PDB file of C-alpha atoms and ligand atoms in Angstrom:
ATOM      1  CA  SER A   1       0.000   0.000   0.000  1.00 33.71           C
ATOM      2  CA  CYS A   2       2.860   2.342  -0.841  1.00 33.01           C
ATOM      3  CA  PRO A   3       3.368   3.898  -4.299  1.00 34.93           C
ATOM      4  CA  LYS A   4       5.689   2.222  -6.811  1.00 32.34           C
ATOM      5  CA  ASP A   5       9.349   2.416  -5.688  1.00 32.29           C
ATOM      6  CA  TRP A   6       8.428   3.459  -2.118  1.00 31.41           C
ATOM      7  CA  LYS A   7       9.064   1.137   0.819  1.00 31.71           C
ATOM      8  CA  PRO A   8       6.431   0.586   3.537  1.00 31.93           C
ATOM      9  CA  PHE A   9       7.146   0.547   7.237  1.00 33.17           C
ATOM     10  CA  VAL A  10       4.092   0.331   9.492  1.00 33.11           C
ATOM     11  CA  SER A  11       2.185   3.627   9.036  1.00 31.91           C
ATOM     12  CA  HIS A  12       4.603   5.312   6.587  1.00 30.87           C
ATOM     13  CA  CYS A  13       6.084   5.079   3.104  1.00 29.45           C
ATOM     14  CA  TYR A  14       9.774   5.809   2.488  1.00 26.82           C
ATOM     15  CA  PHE A  15      11.620   6.921  -0.641  1.00 25.94           C
ATOM     16  CA  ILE A  16      15.388   6.687  -0.978  1.00 27.45           C
ATOM     17  CA  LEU A  17      16.488   9.598  -3.150  1.00 28.32           C
ATOM     18  CA  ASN A  18      19.511   8.021  -4.860  1.00 30.64           C
ATOM     19  CA  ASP A  19      19.316   9.401  -8.422  1.00 31.09           C
ATOM     20  CA  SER A  20      20.810  12.815  -7.622  1.00 29.53           C
ATOM     21  CA  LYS A  21      22.297  14.943  -4.843  1.00 30.38           C
ATOM     22  CA  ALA A  22      21.058  18.275  -3.527  1.00 32.15           C
ATOM     23  CA  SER A  23      21.387  20.680  -0.605  1.00 31.47           C
ATOM     24  CA  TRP A  24      19.129  20.269   2.425  1.00 27.34           C
ATOM     25  CA  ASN A  25      16.645  22.898   1.253  1.00 29.98           C
ATOM     26  CA  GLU A  26      16.558  21.503  -2.306  1.00 32.90           C
ATOM     27  CA  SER A  27      16.098  17.974  -0.878  1.00 30.06           C
ATOM     28  CA  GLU A  28      13.158  19.057   1.272  1.00 29.69           C
ATOM     29  CA  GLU A  29      11.675  20.702  -1.846  1.00 29.88           C
ATOM     30  CA  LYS A  30      11.982  17.409  -3.787  1.00 29.24           C
ATOM     31  CA  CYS A  31      10.212  15.520  -0.992  1.00 30.15           C
ATOM     32  CA  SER A  32       7.543  18.250  -0.869  1.00 27.01           C
ATOM     33  CA  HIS A  33       6.808  17.847  -4.606  1.00 27.87           C
ATOM     34  CA  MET A  34       5.874  14.242  -3.885  1.00 30.82           C
ATOM     35  CA  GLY A  35       3.643  15.220  -0.945  1.00 31.95           C
ATOM     36  CA  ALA A  36       6.318  14.041   1.498  1.00 29.52           C
ATOM     37  CA  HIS A  37       9.010  15.495   3.802  1.00 29.39           C
ATOM     38  CA  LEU A  38      12.556  14.644   4.807  1.00 32.95           C
ATOM     39  CA  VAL A  39      12.466  11.678   7.169  1.00 34.56           C
ATOM     40  CA  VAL A  40      11.660  12.122  10.856  1.00 33.05           C
ATOM     41  CA  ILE A  41      13.025   9.240  12.943  1.00 32.16           C
ATOM     42  CA  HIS A  42      11.330   8.296  16.222  1.00 30.10           C
ATOM     43  CA  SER A  43      12.740   4.874  17.103  1.00 27.84           C
ATOM     44  CA  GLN A  44      15.620   2.494  16.540  1.00 25.77           C
ATOM     45  CA  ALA A  45      13.178   0.330  14.560  1.00 27.34           C
ATOM     46  CA  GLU A  46      12.714   3.219  12.122  1.00 29.01           C
ATOM     47  CA  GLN A  47      16.463   3.991  12.092  1.00 28.09           C
ATOM     48  CA  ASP A  48      17.362   0.338  11.353  1.00 26.62           C
ATOM     49  CA  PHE A  49      14.614   0.036   8.720  1.00 28.16           C
ATOM     50  CA  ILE A  50      15.941   3.137   6.969  1.00 29.20           C
ATOM     51  CA  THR A  51      19.613   2.120   7.020  1.00 27.60           C
ATOM     52  CA  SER A  52      18.813  -1.353   5.638  1.00 27.82           C
ATOM     53  CA  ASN A  53      17.706   0.498   2.479  1.00 29.77           C
ATOM     54  CA  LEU A  54      20.800   2.720   2.057  1.00 33.15           C
ATOM     55  CA  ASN A  55      24.044   2.604   0.091  1.00 32.87           C
ATOM     56  CA  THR A  56      27.074   2.583   2.414  1.00 37.34           C
ATOM     57  CA  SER A  57      28.976   4.886   0.020  1.00 38.19           C
ATOM     58  CA  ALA A  58      26.356   7.656   0.306  1.00 40.28           C
ATOM     59  CA  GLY A  59      25.086  10.189   2.855  1.00 40.19           C
ATOM     60  CA  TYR A  60      21.404  10.930   3.324  1.00 39.15           C
ATOM     61  CA  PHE A  61      19.765  14.096   4.641  1.00 41.80           C
ATOM     62  CA  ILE A  62      17.106  13.648   7.302  1.00 40.46           C
ATOM     63  CA  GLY A  63      14.557  16.157   8.606  1.00 41.97           C
ATOM     64  CA  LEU A  64      16.565  17.254  11.665  1.00 42.70           C
ATOM     65  CA  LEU A  65      17.848  20.822  12.082  1.00 39.31           C
ATOM     66  CA  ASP A  66      19.806  22.801  14.658  1.00 39.90           C
ATOM     67  CA  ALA A  67      17.403  25.642  15.522  1.00 40.97           C
ATOM     68  CA  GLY A  68      20.195  27.383  17.430  1.00 41.13           C
ATOM     69  CA  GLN A  69      22.798  26.405  20.019  1.00 36.25           C
ATOM     70  CA  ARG A  70      22.427  22.664  19.380  1.00 37.22           C
ATOM     71  CA  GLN A  71      18.640  22.643  19.823  1.00 33.74           C
ATOM     72  CA  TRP A  72      17.752  19.813  17.446  1.00 36.81           C
ATOM     73  CA  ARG A  73      14.278  20.048  15.973  1.00 38.30           C
ATOM     74  CA  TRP A  74      12.313  17.871  13.557  1.00 36.33           C
ATOM     75  CA  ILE A  75      10.835  19.560  10.522  1.00 34.73           C
ATOM     76  CA  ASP A  76       7.313  18.249  11.240  1.00 35.58           C
ATOM     77  CA  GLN A  77       7.493  19.840  14.716  1.00 37.64           C
ATOM     78  CA  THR A  78       7.130  16.482  16.484  1.00 35.46           C
ATOM     79  CA  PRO A  79       9.180  16.419  19.697  1.00 36.69           C
ATOM     80  CA  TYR A  80      12.889  15.595  19.590  1.00 35.21           C
ATOM     81  CA  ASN A  81      13.121  12.486  21.768  1.00 33.93           C
ATOM     82  CA  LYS A  82      16.551  12.205  23.405  1.00 35.26           C
ATOM     83  CA  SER A  83      15.888   8.488  24.034  1.00 39.16           C
ATOM     84  CA  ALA A  84      15.949   7.706  20.300  1.00 38.73           C
ATOM     85  CA  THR A  85      18.965   9.366  18.690  1.00 38.29           C
ATOM     86  CA  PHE A  86      21.799   7.775  16.717  1.00 35.41           C
ATOM     87  CA  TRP A  87      24.721  10.161  16.619  1.00 35.44           C
ATOM     88  CA  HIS A  88      28.089   8.842  15.504  1.00 37.37           C
ATOM     89  CA  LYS A  89      30.791   8.879  18.131  1.00 39.19           C
ATOM     90  CA  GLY A  90      32.082  12.461  18.337  1.00 40.34           C
ATOM     91  CA  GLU A  91      28.965  13.949  16.692  1.00 39.89           C
ATOM     92  CA  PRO A  92      27.398  16.421  16.481  1.00 39.82           C
ATOM     93  CA  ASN A  93      30.547  18.547  16.558  1.00 41.96           C
ATOM     94  CA  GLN A  94      30.347  21.899  14.762  1.00 42.14           C
ATOM     95  CA  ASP A  95      28.050  24.916  15.194  1.00 38.95           C
ATOM     96  CA  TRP A  96      28.032  25.774  11.491  1.00 38.46           C
ATOM     97  CA  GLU A  97      26.864  22.251  10.606  1.00 38.46           C
ATOM     98  CA  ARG A  98      23.150  22.771  11.131  1.00 38.74           C
ATOM     99  CA  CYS A  99      21.742  19.876   9.068  1.00 39.25           C
ATOM    100  CA  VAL A 100      22.064  16.126   9.611  1.00 39.60           C
ATOM    101  CA  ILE A 101      22.877  13.118   7.464  1.00 41.55           C
ATOM    102  CA  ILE A 102      22.826   9.400   8.000  1.00 45.04           C
ATOM    103  CA  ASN A 103      26.183   8.022   6.858  1.00 41.62           C
ATOM    104  CA  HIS A 104      28.233   4.874   7.277  1.00 42.25           C
ATOM    105  CA  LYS A 105      31.542   4.452   9.077  1.00 40.58           C
ATOM    106  CA  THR A 106      33.628   1.522  10.353  1.00 39.46           C
ATOM    107  CA  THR A 107      31.534   1.552  13.547  1.00 39.55           C
ATOM    108  CA  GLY A 108      28.323   1.353  11.475  1.00 41.55           C
ATOM    109  CA  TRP A 109      25.483   3.713  10.540  1.00 43.45           C
ATOM    110  CA  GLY A 110      24.854   6.935  12.387  1.00 44.74           C
ATOM    111  CA  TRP A 111      24.026  10.625  12.315  1.00 45.53           C
ATOM    112  CA  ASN A 112      26.483  13.415  11.582  1.00 44.92           C
ATOM    113  CA  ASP A 113      25.939  17.153  11.549  1.00 42.16           C
ATOM    114  CA  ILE A 114      26.999  18.692   8.237  1.00 40.52           C
ATOM    115  CA  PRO A 115      26.591  21.979   6.350  1.00 36.84           C
ATOM    116  CA  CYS A 116      23.103  22.334   4.882  1.00 37.23           C
ATOM    117  CA  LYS A 117      24.603  23.540   1.599  1.00 37.72           C
ATOM    118  CA  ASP A 118      26.597  20.328   1.015  1.00 36.87           C
ATOM    119  CA  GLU A 119      24.899  18.185  -1.614  1.00 35.74           C
ATOM    120  CA  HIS A 120      23.775  14.709  -0.569  1.00 37.81           C
ATOM    121  CA  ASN A 121      21.212  12.039  -1.128  1.00 41.24           C
ATOM    122  CA  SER A 122      18.140  12.011   1.125  1.00 37.99           C
ATOM    123  CA  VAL A 123      15.190  10.017   2.467  1.00 35.67           C
ATOM    124  CA  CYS A 124      11.571  11.186   2.062  1.00 38.26           C
ATOM    125  CA  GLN A 125       8.666  10.042   4.162  1.00 39.63           C
ATOM    126  CA  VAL A 126       4.882  10.239   3.917  1.00 38.83           C
ATOM    127  CA  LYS A 127       2.002   8.693   5.865  1.00 39.90           C
ATOM    128  CA  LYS A 128       0.245   5.856   4.023  1.00 38.04           C
TER     129      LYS A 128
HETATM  130  C1  LIG B   1      40.347  15.118   8.183  1.00 43.23           C
HETATM  131  O1  LIG B   1      38.945  15.361   8.378  1.00 43.23           O
HETATM  132  C2  LIG B   1      38.715  16.677   8.853  1.00 43.23           C
HETATM  133  O2  LIG B   1      38.968  17.640   7.823  1.00 43.23           O
HETATM  134  C3  LIG B   1      38.185  17.531   6.629  1.00 43.23           C
HETATM  135  C4  LIG B   1      38.633  18.630   5.681  1.00 43.23           C
HETATM  136  O3  LIG B   1      39.862  18.181   5.084  1.00 43.23           O
HETATM  137  C5  LIG B   1      40.420  19.227   4.269  1.00 43.23           C
HETATM  138  O4  LIG B   1      40.989  20.268   5.042  1.00 43.23           O
HETATM  139  C6  LIG B   1      42.055  19.899   5.903  1.00 43.23           C
HETATM  140  C7  LIG B   1      42.559  21.154   6.611  1.00 43.23           C
HETATM  141  O5  LIG B   1      41.602  21.582   7.553  1.00 43.23           O
HETATM  142  C8  LIG B   1      43.179  19.230   5.105  1.00 43.23           C
HETATM  143  O6  LIG B   1      44.145  18.679   5.967  1.00 43.23           O
HETATM  144  C9  LIG B   1      42.640  18.119   4.206  1.00 43.23           C
HETATM  145  O7  LIG B   1      43.683  17.641   3.387  1.00 43.23           O
HETATM  146  C10 LIG B   1      41.472  18.606   3.352  1.00 43.23           C
HETATM  147  O8  LIG B   1      41.939  19.555   2.411  1.00 43.23           O
HETATM  148  C11 LIG B   1      41.062  19.724   1.288  1.00 43.23           C
HETATM  149  O9  LIG B   1      41.166  18.663   0.349  1.00 43.23           O
HETATM  150  C12 LIG B   1      40.245  18.739  -0.723  1.00 43.23           C
HETATM  151  C13 LIG B   1      40.387  17.487  -1.585  1.00 43.23           C
HETATM  152  O10 LIG B   1      39.811  16.379  -0.928  1.00 43.23           O
HETATM  153  C14 LIG B   1      40.508  20.024  -1.517  1.00 43.23           C
HETATM  154  O11 LIG B   1      39.576  20.180  -2.560  1.00 43.23           O
HETATM  155  C15 LIG B   1      40.431  21.248  -0.601  1.00 43.23           C
HETATM  156  O12 LIG B   1      40.803  22.396  -1.335  1.00 43.23           O
HETATM  157  C16 LIG B   1      41.337  21.080   0.619  1.00 43.23           C
HETATM  158  N1  LIG B   1      41.140  22.152   1.590  1.00 43.23           N
HETATM  159  C17 LIG B   1      42.123  22.706   2.308  1.00 43.23           C
HETATM  160  C18 LIG B   1      41.728  23.779   3.277  1.00 43.23           C
HETATM  161  O13 LIG B   1      43.309  22.385   2.219  1.00 43.23           O
HETATM  162  C19 LIG B   1      36.676  17.566   6.918  1.00 43.23           C
HETATM  163  O14 LIG B   1      35.981  17.157   5.741  1.00 43.23           O
HETATM  164  C20 LIG B   1      35.161  18.174   5.169  1.00 43.23           C
HETATM  165  O15 LIG B   1      33.906  18.281   5.820  1.00 43.23           O
HETATM  166  C21 LIG B   1      33.131  19.356   5.305  1.00 43.23           C
HETATM  167  C22 LIG B   1      31.878  19.488   6.168  1.00 43.23           C
HETATM  168  O16 LIG B   1      32.224  19.991   7.440  1.00 43.23           O
HETATM  169  C23 LIG B   1      32.789  19.143   3.832  1.00 43.23           C
HETATM  170  O17 LIG B   1      32.137  20.282   3.310  1.00 43.23           O
HETATM  171  C24 LIG B   1      34.073  18.893   3.034  1.00 43.23           C
HETATM  172  O18 LIG B   1      33.758  18.451   1.734  1.00 43.23           O
HETATM  173  C25 LIG B   1      34.956  17.837   3.696  1.00 43.23           C
HETATM  174  N2  LIG B   1      36.243  17.774   3.013  1.00 43.23           N
HETATM  175  C26 LIG B   1      36.856  16.623   2.724  1.00 43.23           C
HETATM  176  C27 LIG B   1      38.179  16.760   2.023  1.00 43.23           C
HETATM  177  O19 LIG B   1      36.420  15.503   3.001  1.00 43.23           O
HETATM  178  C28 LIG B   1      36.346  16.594   8.053  1.00 43.23           C
HETATM  179  O20 LIG B   1      34.990  16.811   8.477  1.00 43.23           O
HETATM  180  C29 LIG B   1      34.163  15.638   8.321  1.00 43.23           C
HETATM  181  O21 LIG B   1      34.403  14.659   9.317  1.00 43.23           O
HETATM  182  C30 LIG B   1      34.068  15.038  10.647  1.00 43.23           C
HETATM  183  C31 LIG B   1      34.432  13.893  11.595  1.00 43.23           C
HETATM  184  O22 LIG B   1      35.844  13.709  11.575  1.00 43.23           O
HETATM  185  C32 LIG B   1      32.569  15.402  10.722  1.00 43.23           C
HETATM  186  O23 LIG B   1      32.079  15.902  11.965  1.00 43.23           O
HETATM  187  C33 LIG B   1      32.261  16.508   9.725  1.00 43.23           C
HETATM  188  O24 LIG B   1      30.866  16.779   9.898  1.00 43.23           O
HETATM  189  C34 LIG B   1      32.694  16.069   8.319  1.00 43.23           C
HETATM  190  O25 LIG B   1      31.923  14.949   7.931  1.00 43.23           O
HETATM  191  C35 LIG B   1      31.737  14.796   6.526  1.00 43.23           C
HETATM  192  O26 LIG B   1      30.742  15.672   6.024  1.00 43.23           O
HETATM  193  C36 LIG B   1      30.530  15.577   4.628  1.00 43.23           C
HETATM  194  C37 LIG B   1      29.512  16.656   4.286  1.00 43.23           C
HETATM  195  O27 LIG B   1      29.620  17.088   2.946  1.00 43.23           O
HETATM  196  C38 LIG B   1      30.037  14.168   4.278  1.00 43.23           C
HETATM  197  O28 LIG B   1      29.890  14.049   2.885  1.00 43.23           O
HETATM  198  C39 LIG B   1      30.990  13.093   4.804  1.00 43.23           C
HETATM  199  O29 LIG B   1      30.372  11.825   4.680  1.00 43.23           O
HETATM  200  C40 LIG B   1      31.322  13.338   6.275  1.00 43.23           C
HETATM  201  N3  LIG B   1      32.392  12.502   6.796  1.00 43.23           N
HETATM  202  C41 LIG B   1      32.315  11.860   7.962  1.00 43.23           C
HETATM  203  C42 LIG B   1      33.528  11.091   8.380  1.00 43.23           C
HETATM  204  O30 LIG B   1      31.309  11.896   8.684  1.00 43.23           O
HETATM  205  C43 LIG B   1      37.251  16.780   9.266  1.00 43.23           C
HETATM  206  O31 LIG B   1      37.016  18.049   9.896  1.00 43.23           O
HETATM  207 CA1   CA B   2      29.892  16.885  12.070  1.00 41.95          CA
END
């Protein structure tokens, strides 16, 4: 019950934007054109579902932003739950890196703060 090329997970459909790279704002615009938004992750189940679908050579924007002074906020305004975050060791690390990607390292998948202007792949999400 998800559209062609989207992957279902419980109440949502997920799209892995692999065909091109874009800035955070451009990525959110692409998701928006499909009636979706950059992914908002509320559990390890969701995190692990998403990473199972990703290329280890690529980085993927998610819908998490530093609103100021390391105040992480989801783009759909749902609460940032400190009990379900997946930062890489040593991340987040830099004030001018206000956007977040999922990327892969020797220690596995995780989140890293990066500059919003840096072009990456992304994951879109929409309710079924
Ligand atoms: C060694 O890692 C640290 O430095 C990286 C920058 O390295 C350049 O600058 C240093 C001097 O400061 C120099 O010693 C290096 O040789 C290198 O020089 C540059 O080389 C390139 C050719 O590759 C050349 O074109 C440049 O002219 C030349 N510049 C200079 C000044 O000599 C840094 O990596 C950078 O990260 C930023 C985002 O902050 C990104 O825009 C840059 O593209 C990227 N540059 C390179 C070369 O990779 C490292 O920062 C990483 O890793 C940190 C953890 O150690 C993370 O916290 C950071 O968030 C950042 O993560 C990366 O973010 C990009 C986002 O675009 C993402 O694609 C990657 O997957 C991700 N990597 C990881 C490991 O998460 C770090 O400070
Ligand atoms: Ca970082």
